[PDB]
Amino acid sequence: AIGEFMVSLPRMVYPQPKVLTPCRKDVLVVTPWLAPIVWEGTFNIDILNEQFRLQNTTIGLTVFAIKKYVAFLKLFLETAEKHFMVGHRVHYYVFTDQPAAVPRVTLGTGRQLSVLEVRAYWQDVSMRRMEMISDFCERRFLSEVDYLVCVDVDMEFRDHVGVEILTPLFGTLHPSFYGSSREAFTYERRPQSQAYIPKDEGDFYYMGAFFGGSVQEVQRLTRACHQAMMVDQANGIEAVWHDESHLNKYLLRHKPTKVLSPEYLWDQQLLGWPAVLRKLRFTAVPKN
Amino acid sequence: AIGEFMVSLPRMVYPQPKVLTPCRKDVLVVTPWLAPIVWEGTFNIDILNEQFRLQNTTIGLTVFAIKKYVAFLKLFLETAEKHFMVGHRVHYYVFTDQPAAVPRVTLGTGRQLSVLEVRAYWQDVSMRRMEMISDFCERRFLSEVDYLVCVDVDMEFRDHVGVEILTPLFGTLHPSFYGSSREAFTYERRPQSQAYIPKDEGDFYYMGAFFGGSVQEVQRLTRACHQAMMVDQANGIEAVWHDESHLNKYLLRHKPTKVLSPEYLWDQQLLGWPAVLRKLRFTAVPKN
Numbered sequence: 001a002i003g004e005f006m007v008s009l010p011r012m013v014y015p016q017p018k019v020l021t022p023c024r025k026d027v028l029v030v031t032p033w034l035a036p037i038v039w040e041g042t043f044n045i046d047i048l049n050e051q052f053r054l055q056n057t058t059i060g061l062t063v064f065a066i067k068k069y070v071a072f073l074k075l076f077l078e079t080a081e082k083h084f085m086v087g088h089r090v091h092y093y094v095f096t097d098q099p100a101a102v103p104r105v106t107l108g109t110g111r112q113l114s115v116l117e118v119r120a121y122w123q124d125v126s127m128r129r130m131e132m133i134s135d136f137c138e139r140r141f142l143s144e145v146d147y148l149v150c151v152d153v154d155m156e157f158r159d160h161v162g163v164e165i166l167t168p169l170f171g172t173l174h175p176s177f178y179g180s181s182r183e184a185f186t187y188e189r190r191p192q193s194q195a196y197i198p199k200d201e202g203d204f205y206y207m208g209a210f211f212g213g214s215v216q217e218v219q220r221l222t223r224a225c226h227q228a229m230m231v232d233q234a235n236g237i238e239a240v241w242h243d244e245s246h247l248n249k250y251l252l253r254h255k256p257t258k259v260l261s262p263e264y265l266w267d268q269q270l271l272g273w274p275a276v277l278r279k280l281r282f283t284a285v286p287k288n
Numbered sequence: 289a290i291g292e293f294m295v296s297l298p299r300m301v302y303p304q305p306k307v308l309t310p311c312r313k314d315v316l317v318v319t320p321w322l323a324p325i326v327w328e329g330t331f332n333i334d335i336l337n338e339q340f341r342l343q344n345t346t347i348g349l350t351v352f353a354i355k356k357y358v359a360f361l362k363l364f365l366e367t368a369e370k371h372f373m374v375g376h377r378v379h380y381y382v383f384t385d386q387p388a389a390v391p392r393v394t395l396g397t398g399r400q401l402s403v404l405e406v407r408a409y410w411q412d413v414s415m416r417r418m419e420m421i422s423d424f425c426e427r428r429f430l431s432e433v434d435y436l437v438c439v440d441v442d443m444e445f446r447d448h449v450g451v452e453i454l455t456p457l458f459g460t461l462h463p464s465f466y467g468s469s470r471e472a473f474t475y476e477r478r479p480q481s482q483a484y485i486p487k488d489e490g491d492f493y494y495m496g497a498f499f500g501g502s503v504q505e506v507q508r509l510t511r512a513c514h515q516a517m518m519v520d521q522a523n524g525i526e527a528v529w530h531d532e533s534h535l536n537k538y539l540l541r542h543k544p545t546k547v548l549s550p551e552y553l554w555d556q557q558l559l560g561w562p563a564v565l566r567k568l569r570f571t572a573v574p575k576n
């Protein structure tokens with residue numbers, strides 16, 4: 001449950017936070033709109049686990065595995081079982097055109113998986129994830145989970161991804177652009193697109209492969225992006241990076257209440273393991 | 289309004305936040321439970337003003353001026369008009385035993401003041417602020433304001449205090465203890481008190497002179513503190529720092545969603561103007 005009466009935390013013994021000692025001096029840990037940017041060292045997971053378990057939090061995880069991408073499900077789900085929200089209630093929603101190709105993955109207690117069949121297939125395909133999350137699953141998600149997390153399938157968990165990410169609305173810093181100036185961001189730059197962002201605007205470049213929030217906020221985001229993509233289709237334009245371009249426009253105009261660092265979306269083959277990353281949590285798998 | 293549909297921000301031109309450049313390297317800007325700690329340099333007030341004005345936010349400010357403390361009202365209110373939530377809707381609630389001693393202070397547009405008469409007077413006096421904020425003003429605050437801010441009167445505003453503070457629940461770092469280790473904090477240490485905190489617990493020492501949040505969360509806090517103070521009275525014990533001791537116990541067990549730095553509660557006569565304070569926003573007036 002979100003927003004409901006919160007019982008007291010129990011007594012806990014942990015290191016005192018010290019006002020004159022930053023957790024991290026090498027990175028920005030809060031946005032200019034006072035949203036935490038989540039890096040290792042910024043959170044005490046024991047405190048957060050307590051807070052979220054006291055609310056009996058349920059997290060939904062959506063993932064699409066259409067056509068050949070069903071091959072990625074086994075590693076995705078098996079590593080999610082090792083690293084994603086362990087100890088919390090989790091409901092996986094696997095959207096696929098091949099229900100029989102979903103691997104039988106053994107789940108920990110308090111965790112469940114639903115296979116949701118969708119159509120095979122390009123413009124309706126580009127809008128598929130945003131449309132599916134909003135238009136068709138609206139009522140189900142509201143009844144079943146407190147938060148939704150929406151990720152790419154061509155990925156594996158290598159380390160902890162937990163309740164530190166949960167908040168009304170979050171996006172994730174794209175691993176290729178976190179050091180870039182805004183003029184270099186690959187936002188949609190054509191004013192004829194609903195995703196248009198001028199060269200003097202932009203906070204961050206968020207990747208389309210990991211976003212989430214409360215069910216209400218995720219449905220707001222996905223509905224807005226779906227509607228904007230439909231306008232573009234009607235006007236004969238497709239944004240340069242498809243749903244990611246629209247996600248970036250949305251998060252510019254509706255600031256996220258947390259931002260995940262690139263620990264949460266990394267490609268080691270492409271980008272190595274820089275000093276600023278203490279953990280590589282959720283990482284690209286080769287898709288050639 | 290809180291928690292309601294949020295319209296898009298307009299286009300804004302402002303400096304890009306840079307991931308590899310902290311706003312502040314000299315202080316902790318986020319707690320281990322991912323609450324921002326509000327210091328100058330951590331927020332873009334233009335973004336925040338936009339967000340809160342788009343919600344037509346109304347802020348209530350409670351202040352008690354009983355017996356000789358009515359003398360502090362003129363400077364308190366006149367400086368609040370210069371610095372507190374300017375541009376936003378503000379409702380001052382002045383609780384006093386001398387309604388006729390409230391100074392006639394000229395208010396900016398969209399701002400109003402209500403004089404609420406209370407009894408003169410020691411144990412019911414110690415609980416007065418927490419009881420008054422909870423038990424008697426519950427319905428009125430819910431109908432009239434979105435956030436409540438609860439402050440001492442023996443104070444003046446010298447610089448901006450604005451919507452950067454607003455959040456479901458906040459406390460303020462006590463200016464005398466922000467560099468102290470938790471064992472040195474003047475928490476109530478007797479296990480016979482409801483305010484008891486052992487020497488190995490505690491995040492911060494919050495001052496009783498500036499706390500706030502949403503109306504719901506402030507009523508939860510003030511009700512809990514009032515109830516705990518009544519238990520102590522029944523058991524023949526008064527906590528070492530009265531309502532502040534109880535506030536500290538509450539905020540240990542119910543973590544605040546922002547923490548205000550000592551910019552927001554300072555005594556220059558006692559503590560000077562240290563390098564870590566870029567602004568002195570709300571400061572002690574002599575009360576001899």
Ligand SMILES: O=c1ccn([C@@H]2O[C@H](COP(=O)(O)OP(=O)(O)C[C@H]3O[C@H](CO)[C@H](O)[C@H](O)[C@H]3O)[C@@H](O)[C@H]2O)c(=O)[nH]1
Pocket residue numbers: 063064065066067068069070151152153154207208209241242243244245287
């Ligand atoms: O045949 C398919 C194709 C895709 N998918 C699904 O879509 C997800 C994104 O695609 P991909 O990972 O290739 O792109 P990335 O380059 O890692 C991710 C980026 O590029 C996309 C276009 O390829 C979009 O622009 C997206 O917005 C952006 O983030 C993929 O993980 C699957 O869950 C599927 O199930 N079957």
Ligand SMILES: O=c1ccn([C@@H]2O[C@H](COP(=O)(O)OP(=O)(O)C[C@H]3O[C@H](CO)[C@H](O)[C@H](O)[C@H]3O)[C@@H](O)[C@H]2O)c(=O)[nH]1
Pocket residue numbers: 351352353354355356357358439440441442495496497529530531532533575
């Ligand atoms: O005759 C009075 C006495 C008080 N008040 C009201 O109470 C507020 C707190 O008291 P004070 O500022 O003296 O204490 P400080 O030392 O600045 C504040 C601290 O000490 C308190 C006891 O004196 C409590 O322990 C409190 O919890 C703690 O923060 C004061 O600002 C007035 O709004 C009033 O209206 N008439």
Ligand SMILES: [Mn+2]
Pocket residue numbers: 152153154209
């Ligand atoms: Mn991908």
Ligand SMILES: [Mn+2]
Pocket residue numbers: 440441442497
């Ligand atoms: Mn005072």
